[PDB]
A = this chain, B = another copy of it.
């Protein structure tokens, strides 16, 4: 599993469950092309987005649909979504976890990249 996404809710102190996540890969024409997507699980995680074969070097965007999450909880939010944009780099073996910690008017994102 070369790419995993984990989303946490700082208001409820819980995983952020059933959050839509869309991954895009930058194309040669510099547009964003759909790459993978899903909804976070009961543990706030989304696994199985891609494979080592498909996840080649390039620029990727992970879009987390935070606004719909806050709306569905009856809470007013600031952002349309959280976007995480990064270059995948081969530099020996690699696994990427994109984590996000959500509040209505703030989010934090970190990358945990391990071998």
Contacts and interface: CB of A to CB of B under 8 A. Distances in A.
When all copies of this chain in the complex are counted, the total is 4
Contact of A114 (B11, B14, B59, B106): B14
A29 to B, nearest CB: 14
Contact of A105 (B12, B79, B80): B12
Contacts of A12: 104-105
Contact of A113 (B11, B13, B107): B13
A3 interface: no
B80 A13 contact: no
A79 B85 CA distance: 6
A8 interface: yes
A12 to B, nearest CB: 7
Nearest to A99: B8
A13 B104 contact: yes
